[PDB]
Design a protein around this ligand. Structure first.
Ligand SMILES: *[C@@H]1O[C@H](CO)[C@@H](O[C@@H]2O[C@H](CO)[C@@H](O)[C@H](O)[C@H]2NC(C)=O)[C@H](O)[C@H]1NC(C)=O
Ligand SMILES: *[C@@H]1O[C@H](CO)[C@@H](O)[C@H](O)[C@H]1NC(C)=O
Ligand SMILES: *[C@@H]1O[C@H](CO)[C@@H](O)[C@H](O)[C@H]1NC(C)=O
Ligand SMILES: *[C@@H]1O[C@H](CO)[C@@H](O)[C@H](O)[C@H]1NC(C)=O
Ligand SMILES: *[C@@H]1O[C@H](CO)[C@@H](O)[C@H](O)[C@H]1NC(C)=O
Ligand SMILES: *[C@@H]1O[C@H](CO)[C@@H](O)[C@H](O)[C@H]1NC(C)=O
Lengths: 465, 96, 48, 48, 48, 48
């Protein structure tokens, strides 16, 4: 055993909307028809592993439970992740007259003869409690569906008079309870003072409603081509003929990754860990080529003031290849970091370093006060405060001509003219807006892969046909 | 120095000294769905007239009439064959 | 008398081998179905 | 591209985080859907 | 305007730098594409 | 200005029959924000 046919079991009302004599086609998490359901009489049935151990089952997207027991031997469930008091978990335990649902940091329960049981062990930092929500919850099949959607814990259930194991038939599960637990449920456990578990998957079903709003039948759109046809037509009756359904495709069997023989790493260490950095006026451009674009070193090196990538939003830069990579390195004031971006203005964006408006790449700002500041002031950094025109994208203007302020020629400095390069010292006593920051802009040109600056991926064997 | 001296229980009359009860509210507004929110006032039910309505968050304009549809205990509203709402359950009386 | 008959799968054309794109495409409703019906009707008309 | 950074969906998903990929994909969905509706309209006229 | 700040392309280009001007222009392009496509489609039906 | 008004009483100064040059605005201070709506900065040296 440990598997079963399941038949047409596990359908629940997907929402709280009344419908009358219609067929509703919907996509939601359902137990597929004729799928395998795990039967736990083996392994943990009867006494099973009680008093010593019990395996924990996964909770993938949602679960379907069923039992034919009327003894109330099965009493409850725990949902959560760690399930050891390290994190929050939700415990639902039934009683003869009430239901106790609590979400707290649980360590373990007395329930992994039966004269007394379930006193529990220890708990703290509890967040919510719910009491007797539904008050209670010839054999009786007790079906439940437990689903976790955007922090809401949805419980559906149905009682069917049954002695057959999953007899053929259909019955929809009405919603029972909806809790704002707000937690993460990756694993779950049953509690004993016979049991079936199926798992839900995203599927499309056509649900048949009667005049009184009850779901009386359903079609699983992926069970067979006839069901798919019924879903396409939104009917439980199909006329004689040929109907067109979803297209078929052959799926891949393996992943083929091919990269050049290059194992050299890109010299990001030397540029970013340099002991002396260039000024904004003479900003330093180093070309990166013929190397592995491993960016793990960048995150390991230091925390950054800003790591903002334009055109490639993720930090997962190791999966791409580049065709033209440049690192532009310069030192700026903290209050100027916001100016190093497309569309920005100010003395730096306008006269020292400007990005194109279609720029692709990453701007990485690191606080370097402990290295660049001096008590006397570090006067090796010199922004060009005054310029006649605005700087072009990626233009390096290193002219040393004295700027004349209008009509007067004013050769020399003073009366109506300024030497364009203005020194400002950095000192340990300045605030975060004035302290020096090192900024490197990594310009990434992405046009297929004529050239390789590919990241730290491995090559596999080539498979043809 | 000890925090346990009585300080301001004694009246010790001055504007500075008179005790005041101070209560502060965090208003945490975390990510998990909020369970705390202020009470939403209701208004008397009007039927057989063209009115605007909001039934437990479902809004619209229309004429409300007594319905013969029989909703299941958990259903709050209904829709017709083209998925447009055509019936509601009154949140206070449970009339359809 | 007749025209070349074609059938176009909306999902593969717009969102080929893309689950996220297909999920986004589902938010536009029946448009893919309407185009499928239009091309089927054309194919039947050409055989008629 | 229809205004997108790239005409290839696999480049959008491999290059951008979902919240930006949805925007670039939506632009491509709009362009491709308009192309199919234009095609179908001309085929209906030619069918007539 | 089709959602643009102005229906005139010269005003959009004069007032805004490319990063936003391209967005406003894209909306005017989209609206005019729909206008021309509707015009031609109806002219094809009327011509038939 | 030596004094700025309180937020409950914003001071509205009308500017008319004049010419504007915006390099002075950059000269007055480093800015916390300079966000424009309906027009981009540096395009204000045309009729604004
Ligand atoms: C709360 O809701 C209940 C029903 O859900 C209301 O109870 C009925 O109210 C009507 C009119 O007030 C009475 O004629 C019924 O006899 C009541 N039913 C019962 C069982 O008592 C109740 O009035 C609502 N309360 C408020 C303050 O609106
Ligand atoms: C669920 O896990 C994610 C993992 O990043 C975490 O950010 C989130 O806070 C968790 N939510 C809980 C425990 O409610
Ligand atoms: C629906 O409810 C009415 C109530 O009178 C009943 O007469 C009818 O038989 C019910 N139909 C079904 C299919 O349950
Ligand atoms: C890298 O930085 C460390 C300080 O964190 C320094 O000790 C080391 O010498 C630097 N290496 C180079 C090559 O600059
Ligand atoms: C720019 O960086 C490279 C890295 O090797 C270095 O050789 C070069 O001298 C630097 N130039 C300036 C102006 O800092
Ligand atoms: C507002 O500015 C004008 C500038 O001329 C000044 O005359 C006026 O007194 C100011 N008002 C206030 C309330 O500051």
């Amino acid at each position: 055993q440990s598997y079963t046919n399941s038949f047409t079991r596990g359908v629940y009302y997907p929402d709280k909307v009344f419908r009358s004599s219609v067929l509703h086609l919907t996509q939601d998490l359902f137990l597929p028809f004729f799928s395998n359901v795990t039967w736990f009489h083996a392994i943990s049935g009867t006494n099973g592993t009680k008093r010593f151990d019990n395996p924990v089952l996964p909770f993938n997207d949602g679960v379907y439970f069923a039992s034919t027991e009327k003894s109330n031997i099965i009493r409850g469930w725990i949902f959560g992740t760690t399930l050891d008091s390290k994190t929050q978990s939700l415990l639902i335990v039934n009683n003869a007259t009430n239901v106790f649902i609590k979400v707290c940091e649980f360590q373990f329960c007395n329930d992994p003869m039966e004269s007394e049981s379930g006193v529990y062990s220890s708990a703290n930092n509890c967040t919510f409690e719910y009491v007797s929500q539904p008050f209670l919850m010839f054999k009786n099949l007790r079906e439940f569906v437990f689903k976790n959607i955007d922090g809401y814990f949805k419980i559906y259930s149905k009682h069917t008079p049954i002695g057959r194991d999953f007899p053929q038939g259909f019955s929809a599960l009405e919603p029972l309870v909806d809790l704002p637990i707000g937690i993460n449920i990756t694993r779950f456990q049953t509690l004993l003072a016979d049991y079936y578990v199926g798992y839900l998957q995203p599927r499309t079903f056509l649900l048949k409603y009667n005049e009184n709003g009850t779901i009386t039948d359903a079609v699983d759109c992926a069970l067979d081509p006839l069901s798919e046809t019924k879903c396409t037509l939104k009917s439980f009756t199909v006329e004689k003929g040929i109907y067109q359904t979803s297209n078929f495709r052959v799926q891949p069997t393996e992943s083929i990754v091919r990269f050049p023989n290059v194992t050299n790493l890109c010299p990001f260490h030397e540029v970013f860990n340099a002991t002396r950095f260039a000024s904004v006026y003479a900003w330093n451009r180093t070309r990166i080529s013929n190397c592995v674009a491993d960016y793990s070193v960048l995150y390991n090196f230091a925390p950054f003031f800003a790591f903002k990538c334009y055109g490639v939003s993720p930090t997962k830069l190791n999966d791409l290849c580049f065709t033209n990579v440049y690192a532009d390195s310069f030192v700026i004031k903290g209050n100027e970091v916001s100016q190093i971006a497309p569309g920005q203005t100010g003395n730096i964006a306008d006269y020292n370093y400007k990005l194109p408006d279609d720029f692709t790449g990453c701007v990485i700002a690191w606080n370097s006060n402990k290295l660049d500041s001096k008590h006397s002031g570090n006067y090796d950094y010199w922004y060009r405060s005054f310029r006649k025109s605005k700087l072009k994208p990626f233009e390096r203007d290193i002219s040393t001509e004295i700027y004349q302020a209008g009509n007067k020629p004013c050769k020399g400095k003073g009366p109506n003219c300024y030497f364009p390069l203005q020194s400002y010292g950095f000192r340990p006593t300045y605030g975060v807006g004035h302290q020096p920051y090192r900024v490197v802009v990594l310009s990434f040109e992405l046009l297929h892969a004529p050239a390789t600056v590919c990241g730290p991926k491995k090559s596999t064997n080539l498979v043809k046909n | 120095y000890f925090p346990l001296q009585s300080y301001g229980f004694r009246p010790t009359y001055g504007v500075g000294h008179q005790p005041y009860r101070v209560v502060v509210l965090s208003f945490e507004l975390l990510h998990a769905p909020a369970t705390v929110c202020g009470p939403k006032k209701s208004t008397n039910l009007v039927k057989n007239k063209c009115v605007n309505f909001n039934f437990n968050g479902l809004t619209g304009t229309g004429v409300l009439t007594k319905s013969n549809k029989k909703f299941l205990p958990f259903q709050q509203f209904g829709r017709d064959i083209v998925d447009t709402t055509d019936a509601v359950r009154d949140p206070q009386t449970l009339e359809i | 008398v007749s025209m070349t008959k074609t059938s176009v799968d909306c999902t593969m054309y717009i969102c080929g081998d893309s689950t996220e794109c297909s999920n986004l495409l589902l938010q536009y409703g029946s448009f893919c179905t309407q185009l499928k019906r239009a091309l089927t009707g054309i194919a039947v008309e050409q055989d008629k | 591209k229809f205004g997108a950074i790239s005409s290839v969906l696999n480049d959008i998903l491999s290059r951008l985080d979902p919240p930006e990929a949805e925007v670039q994909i939506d632009r491509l969905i709009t362009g491709r859907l308009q192309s199919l509706q234009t095609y179908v309209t001309q085929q209906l006229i030619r069918a007539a």
